[PDB]
Amino acid sequence: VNNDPAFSTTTSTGNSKNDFSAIAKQQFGVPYKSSGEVCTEYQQVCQTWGSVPSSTGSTTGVLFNGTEFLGAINDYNGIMMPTLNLIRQSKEFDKKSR
């Protein structure tokens, strides 16, 4: 919300051209494959994050690594792992079969 110029409740005190688009002052970014060039499809494996090629005449800094969503899911499953571990607690061979 702070990135987008449209919710600048204060006057537009910076450059009126710098904005990467009308919805973002700065580009958030795009996946990049391991060799650093554009990663348009999953099949070519993407590994890093980066800014778009400068087609608007300027390149705005990327505010993200692209791993915030994945990392957030990782913390999610991290704090679910204990409870499911407890509920799991042999378990494949039972004495009912006797």
Binding site: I23, V30, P31, C39, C46, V52, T67, F69
Partner: peptide
């Protein structure tokens, strides 16, 4: 992946972030 200015929306960020 979403390319160009369309990468500068939250929805496009979601689409792109499932790939890294």
């Amino acid at each position: 992946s979403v390319s160009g200015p369309l990468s500068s929306t939250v929805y496009g960020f979601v689409n792109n972030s499932m790939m890294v």
